[PDB]
Design a protein around this nucleic acid. Structure first.
Ligand SMILES: [Mg+2]
Ligand SMILES: [Mg+2]
Ligand SMILES: [Mg+2]
Ligand SMILES: [Mg+2]
Ligand SMILES: [Mg+2]
Ligand SMILES: [Mg+2]
Ligand SMILES: [Mg+2]
Ligand SMILES: [Mg+2]
Ligand SMILES: [Mg+2]
Ligand SMILES: [Mg+2]
Ligand SMILES: [Mg+2]
Ligand SMILES: [Mg+2]
Ligand SMILES: [Mg+2]
Ligand SMILES: [Mg+2]
Ligand SMILES: [Mg+2]
Ligand SMILES: [Mg+2]
Ligand SMILES: [Mg+2]
Ligand SMILES: [Mg+2]
Ligand SMILES: [Mg+2]
Ligand SMILES: [Mg+2]
Ligand SMILES: [Mg+2]
Ligand SMILES: [Mg+2]
Ligand SMILES: [Mg+2]
Ligand SMILES: [Mg+2]
Ligand SMILES: [Mg+2]
Ligand SMILES: [Mg+2]
Ligand SMILES: [Mg+2]
Ligand SMILES: [Mg+2]
Ligand SMILES: [Mg+2]
Ligand SMILES: [Mg+2]
Ligand SMILES: [Mg+2]
Ligand SMILES: [Mg+2]
Ligand SMILES: [Mg+2]
Ligand SMILES: [Mg+2]
Ligand SMILES: [Mg+2]
Ligand SMILES: [Mg+2]
Ligand SMILES: [Mg+2]
Ligand SMILES: [Mg+2]
Ligand SMILES: [Mg+2]
Ligand SMILES: [Mg+2]
Ligand SMILES: [Mg+2]
Ligand SMILES: [Mg+2]
Ligand SMILES: [Mg+2]
Ligand SMILES: [Mg+2]
Ligand SMILES: [Mg+2]
Ligand SMILES: [Mg+2]
Ligand SMILES: [Mg+2]
Ligand SMILES: [Mg+2]
Ligand SMILES: [Mg+2]
Ligand SMILES: [Mg+2]
Ligand SMILES: [Mg+2]
Ligand SMILES: [Mg+2]
Ligand SMILES: [Mg+2]
Ligand SMILES: [Mg+2]
Ligand SMILES: [Mg+2]
Ligand SMILES: [Mg+2]
Ligand SMILES: [Mg+2]
Ligand SMILES: [Mg+2]
Ligand SMILES: [Mg+2]
Ligand SMILES: [Mg+2]
Ligand SMILES: [Mg+2]
Ligand SMILES: [Mg+2]
Ligand SMILES: [Mg+2]
Ligand SMILES: [Mg+2]
Ligand SMILES: [Mg+2]
Ligand SMILES: [Mg+2]
Ligand SMILES: [Mg+2]
Ligand SMILES: [Mg+2]
Ligand SMILES: [Mg+2]
Ligand SMILES: [Mg+2]
Ligand SMILES: [Mg+2]
Ligand SMILES: [Mg+2]
Ligand SMILES: [Mg+2]
Ligand SMILES: [Mg+2]
Ligand SMILES: [Mg+2]
Ligand SMILES: [Mg+2]
Ligand SMILES: [Mg+2]
Ligand SMILES: [Mg+2]
Ligand SMILES: [Mg+2]
Ligand SMILES: [Mg+2]
Ligand SMILES: [Mg+2]
Ligand SMILES: [Mg+2]
Ligand SMILES: [Mg+2]
Ligand SMILES: [Mg+2]
Ligand SMILES: [Mg+2]
Ligand SMILES: [Mg+2]
Ligand SMILES: [Mg+2]
Ligand SMILES: [Mg+2]
Ligand SMILES: [Mg+2]
Ligand SMILES: [Mg+2]
Ligand SMILES: [Mg+2]
Ligand SMILES: [Mg+2]
Ligand SMILES: [Mg+2]
Ligand SMILES: [Mg+2]
Ligand SMILES: [Mg+2]
Ligand SMILES: [Mg+2]
Ligand SMILES: [Mg+2]
Ligand SMILES: [Mg+2]
Ligand SMILES: [Mg+2]
Ligand SMILES: [Mg+2]
Ligand SMILES: [Mg+2]
Ligand SMILES: [Mg+2]
Ligand SMILES: [Mg+2]
Lengths: 117, 101, 137, 52, 112
RNA sequence: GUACCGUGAGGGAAAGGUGAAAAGAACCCCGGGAGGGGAGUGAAAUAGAGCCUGAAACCGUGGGCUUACAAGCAGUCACGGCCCCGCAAGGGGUUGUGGCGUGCCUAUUGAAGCAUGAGCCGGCGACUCACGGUCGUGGGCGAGCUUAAGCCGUUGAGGC
RNA sequence: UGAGGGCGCGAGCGAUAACGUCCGCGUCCGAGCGCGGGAACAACCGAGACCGCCAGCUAAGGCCCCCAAGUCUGGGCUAA
RNA sequence: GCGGUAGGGGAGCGUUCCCGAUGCCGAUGAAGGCCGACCCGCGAGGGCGGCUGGAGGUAAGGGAAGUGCGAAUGCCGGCA
């Protein structure tokens, strides 16, 4: 019993090519270049899925430090006081209160200040 | 009134009555689940001792569901190593109601 | 979901340069060019302050720097590496040094050049009086 | 074959970018005084004639 | 309405005639007639011929008024090229490609 | 065993496909023809004659998005604008700015290597079978177990 | 599998040269060019990545701007 | 407990062919093709929906291999 390659090799190829669309040049038309670029893309995606955390942490931290420096202290003093006050509150992100409702942010500044020392 | 709940190992801000996507919570498909985890308030309620000792927030478990598929794809060149996984981090959509803290 | 700042409003500032040390002043200025001072910080949109500097020829600097610091600049031609001391730089257009010091501390991306455009320096003083002249120090 | 040789296959984008100026210009014409038909300037043409 | 006409299997390089086809794209019938009439190219012949035949088809088969039709669209594709053996130095033998092109012109009513 | 190659012995190919029926498109039209546009035949002409189905590279036409102070293995994550499917929320396409990022295989102590191999696409392509061993393994039998050639039978029927 | 390699340590050979050479103990690369620091830098510092999160705390290294975090506090030294 | 090359082990996917076939599916349209933002599986893959195409296809459960290609300055053809 013989079995040619048949549909198979095309189907598989087509599948990979389906992801390739959007890419520049042969890299999206040719199966081979498509495969390679898809590999690199997969790895980049996996890595940046961890990068996203660091990036957002940093952005938040900058904003927090800015609005905190509006009141008189720096981010280091802020977190020292806040963690010393007992408020394990606010996954740093939720200090977005710098933007909306900055009054709450100010009361938090005080509660950190007095409990700092 | 503004509110900070900490569930699924993560802290979300919450308005009185709004649809929210949270980590899967083992409960009825459509009953009520208070989140005793709650921080702050609309008219300011700084949570000195980590959790506010006298507040809460009520929500309805709207429904369970699966997240859209995310392909993970490890590949280390020169040594023909390739791995491909599909993934769908499940979740429950909470519907928030009363803010009786 | 983190706050996405909508269409911002510019904010002009007036900054002196008499007696100010080059480095530190330039650094705070750079910090002001980006929106890093404001809680609406967003690295991909650039919405800092219109920084304006006056009396640039009055900038202090420690040590024998005046005579010893050398500004290099190179044309494609062989031996084209030209270099001019800070003394002569102050002899001609002086603000060039503040501009150098600031640009060197900006993000290398295009928006960095944008922020660089949003920066005005003179040594008179006086300036495009315009509207806003909010002094800080 | 000998001495110089293209190290790489020219991308289609680059090719067409070269072809940018290849486009043709329409032939310049003016209506003749005799007939209604079109003529190229400073030249005489059939289905017509001339003066002097 | 629109009216098509296609001259296929024309023994000439497509890219060459395309320069001419692009010169009349979106023009009045009279306009195209004059332009092709005074074009210094070889493709001018075939393109203008299929153009005229196209106008004829338009009026005689799709009762449009000739007084106001135009080049609604026009293009040229590659026909099955002709490979021909060609001698060369030191015994090497390269093959030439006498290509060919399918020319297509379609017209339509002025406006409404 | 032709074309073609070789003085010669010899070498040695490609190339199958309309439709049930030719009913193979009269006549009109443009054209020197070629080729088309009607009309007509047919279930279908996207079955129009190297004609069933018509993939990929490759070449074009129209459209949506986008670019001419910008440094890039061409992707990725993020937010934003324009465009589009949808009551809703959402989703598809594109890419502006920002963060990050030294192709694939091979050979290697070691590669992003200025080491090797691939222009691109499609199809062919590489751990088998026979007998004899060896452990494991699913069963039949057990101090026993099993037949080989062959003969009888049948024509995918087994038995001696 | 039987070309191994770098680093630290103890010797031989060389010249108390070598990104040299040959052994001994350990280590890491190799097989971890996966992750943070050392500007970039297989094997030096930190640390063993099943997957997802716009949660938290630490490591080396750092906390003036590019670039996250003290132009922190207290006390001396250096003028190149 | 789960980095991983050589290597060993385990569990699966698809292609052709046979039993299941005097069967069942197929003009109310088989195989193949094109399209998808839908469904299921960790994955190879299976399924559904629209379009094309025009006569074949083969369950559940088993059986047998000319059985899976991206590279060999691979072979044939097509086209840059
Ligand atoms: Mg094969
Ligand atoms: Mg894209
Ligand atoms: Mg953090
Ligand atoms: Mg549970
Ligand atoms: Mg209920
Ligand atoms: Mg290798
Ligand atoms: Mg290997
Ligand atoms: Mg998102
Ligand atoms: Mg100084
Ligand atoms: Mg300059
Ligand atoms: Mg860049
Ligand atoms: Mg300027
Ligand atoms: Mg183009
Ligand atoms: Mg004349
Ligand atoms: Mg055009
Ligand atoms: Mg001619
Ligand atoms: Mg002959
Ligand atoms: Mg001979
Ligand atoms: Mg002969
Ligand atoms: Mg042959
Ligand atoms: Mg037939
Ligand atoms: Mg006809
Ligand atoms: Mg004749
Ligand atoms: Mg039909
Ligand atoms: Mg039909
Ligand atoms: Mg025939
Ligand atoms: Mg057929
Ligand atoms: Mg066909
Ligand atoms: Mg065709
Ligand atoms: Mg086609
Ligand atoms: Mg635009
Ligand atoms: Mg410039
Ligand atoms: Mg770069
Ligand atoms: Mg537009
Ligand atoms: Mg992009
Ligand atoms: Mg832009
Ligand atoms: Mg980018
Ligand atoms: Mg070797
Ligand atoms: Mg070299
Ligand atoms: Mg070589
Ligand atoms: Mg070699
Ligand atoms: Mg190779
Ligand atoms: Mg080569
Ligand atoms: Mg290759
Ligand atoms: Mg090939
Ligand atoms: Mg074997
Ligand atoms: Mg053995
Ligand atoms: Mg044995
Ligand atoms: Mg067994
Ligand atoms: Mg048994
Ligand atoms: Mg047994
Ligand atoms: Mg027994
Ligand atoms: Mg025998
Ligand atoms: Mg025997
Ligand atoms: Mg017999
Ligand atoms: Mg019988
Ligand atoms: Mg040996
Ligand atoms: Mg040895
Ligand atoms: Mg060696
Ligand atoms: Mg040895
Ligand atoms: Mg060793
Ligand atoms: Mg060692
Ligand atoms: Mg290590
Ligand atoms: Mg090795
Ligand atoms: Mg190891
Ligand atoms: Mg690194
Ligand atoms: Mg590094
Ligand atoms: Mg590192
Ligand atoms: Mg250092
Ligand atoms: Mg250094
Ligand atoms: Mg240490
Ligand atoms: Mg998982
Ligand atoms: Mg701790
Ligand atoms: Mg140190
Ligand atoms: Mg430390
Ligand atoms: Mg300091
Ligand atoms: Mg100090
Ligand atoms: Mg100090
Ligand atoms: Mg000090
Ligand atoms: Mg292990
Ligand atoms: Mg493992
Ligand atoms: Mg190996
Ligand atoms: Mg067969
Ligand atoms: Mg059979
Ligand atoms: Mg049968
Ligand atoms: Mg029918
Ligand atoms: Mg029927
Ligand atoms: Mg039906
Ligand atoms: Mg149908
Ligand atoms: Mg049909
Ligand atoms: Mg079949
Ligand atoms: Mg089948
Ligand atoms: Mg189908
Ligand atoms: Mg499964
Ligand atoms: Mg699928
Ligand atoms: Mg599928
Ligand atoms: Mg289908
Ligand atoms: Mg039949
Ligand atoms: Mg079967
Ligand atoms: Mg291969
Ligand atoms: Mg190949
Ligand atoms: Mg070839
Ligand atoms: Mg060629």
């Amino acid at each position: 019993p013989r079995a040619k390659t048949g549909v198979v090799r095309r189907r598989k190829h087509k599948k990979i090519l389906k992801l390739a669309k959007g890419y520049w040049g042969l890299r999206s038309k040719s199966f081979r270049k498509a495969r390679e670029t898809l590999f690199a893309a997969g790895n980049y995606a996996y890595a940046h899925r961890k990068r996203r955390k660091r990036d957002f942490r940093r952005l938040w931290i900058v904003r927090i430090n800015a609005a905190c420096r509006q009141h008189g202290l720096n981010y280091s003093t802020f977190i020292h006081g806040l963690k010393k006050a007992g408020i394990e509150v606010d996954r740093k992100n939720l200090a977005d209160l710098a933007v909306r409702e900055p009054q709450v942010f100010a009361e938090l500044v005080e509660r950190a200040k007095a409990a700092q020392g | 009134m503004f509110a900070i709940v900490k569930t699924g190992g993560k802290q979300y801000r919450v308005e009185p009555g709004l649809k929210l996507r949270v980590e899967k919570l083992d409960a009825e498909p459509g009953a009520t689940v208070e989140l005793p985890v709650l921080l702050l308030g609309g008219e300011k309620t700084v949570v000195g001792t980590p959790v506010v000792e006298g507040a809460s927030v009520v929500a309805e478990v709207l429904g369970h569901g699966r997240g859209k598929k995310i392909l993970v794809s490890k590949f280390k060149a020169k040594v023909q190593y390739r791995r491909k996984k599909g993934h769908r981090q499940p979740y429950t959509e909470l519907l928030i109601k009363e803010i009786r803290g | 979901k983190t706050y996405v700042p909508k269409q911002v409003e510019p904010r002009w500032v007036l900054i002196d340069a008499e007696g100010k040390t080059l480095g530190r002043l330039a650094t705070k200025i750079a910090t002001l060019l980006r929106g890093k001072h404001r809680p609406d910080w967003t690295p991909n949109v650039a919405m800092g302050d219109f920084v304006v500097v006056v009396n640039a020829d009055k900038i202090r600097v420690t040590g024998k720097k005046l005579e010893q610091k050398i500004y290099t600049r190179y044309s494609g031609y062989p031996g084209g590496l030209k270099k001019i001391p800070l003394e002569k730089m102050l002899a001609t257009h002086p603000e060039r040094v503040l501009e150098h010091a600031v640009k060197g501390m900006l993000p290398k991306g295009p928006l960095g050049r944008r922020l660089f455009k949003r920066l005005k320096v003179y040594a008179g003083p006086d300036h495009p009086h315009q509207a806003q002249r909010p002094e800080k120090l | 074959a000998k001495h110089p040789v293209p190290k790489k296959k020219t991308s289609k984008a680059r090719r067409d970018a070269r072809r940018s100026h290849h486009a043709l210009t329409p032939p310049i014409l003016v209506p003749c005084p005799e007939c209604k038909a079109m003529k190229p300037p400073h030249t005489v043409c059939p289905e017509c004639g001339y003066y002097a | 309405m629109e009216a098509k006409a296609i001259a296929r299997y024309v023994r000439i390089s497509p890219r060459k005639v395309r320069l001419v086809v692009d010169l009349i794209r979106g023009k009045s019938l009279e306009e195209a007639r004059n332009i092709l009439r005074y074009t210094n190219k070889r493709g001018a012949y075939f393109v203008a011929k299929v153009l005229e035949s196209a106008a004829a088809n338009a009026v005689n088969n799709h009762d449009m008024l000739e007084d106001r039709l135009y080049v609604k669209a026009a293009y040229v594709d590659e026909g099955p090229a002709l490979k021909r053996v060609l001698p060369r130095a030191r015994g090497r033998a390269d093959i030439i490609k006498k290509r060919t092109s399918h020319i297509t012109v379609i017209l339509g009513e002025k406006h409404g």
